[PDB]
Design a protein around this nucleic acid. Sequence first.
DNA 1: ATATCTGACACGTGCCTGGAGACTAGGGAGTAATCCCCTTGGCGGTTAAAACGCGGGGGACAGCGCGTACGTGCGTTTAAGCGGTGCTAGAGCTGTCTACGACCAATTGAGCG
Length: 47
Amino acid sequence: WGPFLIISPASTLNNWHQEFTRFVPKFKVLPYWGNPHDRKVIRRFWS
DNA sequence: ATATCTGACACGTGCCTGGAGACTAGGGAGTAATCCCCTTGGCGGTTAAAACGCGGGGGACAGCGCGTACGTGCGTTTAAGCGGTGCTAGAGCTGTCTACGACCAATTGAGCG
């Protein structure tokens, strides 16, 4: 139930969420990339 | 001589600028009906137009004198850097209310009697 963070090379910003659909699907996982208002706006959801 | 530096020189992704495709549906383009308009054009009370006889004053001097110019004195002017550090815009985010949408009433313009 803790907060955690992953940093990765950009071409791996896909398997890093797909793994959390099969190994254990229970996690609250948030991707973060895109145009400024694609990405930054997700910080207004978790606050 | 040597450590290691400053290009060489490239593909990493960010940002936004900037283009073209397929859709709705806003609105532009095509049109009569018909009115009512810009326009043509005679009418006579009123002022543009130019002399003669004339009044108001434009015009050219002489020189007095209340102000105007130079350009240096001298003490008062802003310059000037660079200490601290509050202001200031960025900017991240609400937390609504305020102006702008959706449904339908008082008051108006059109018809002719």
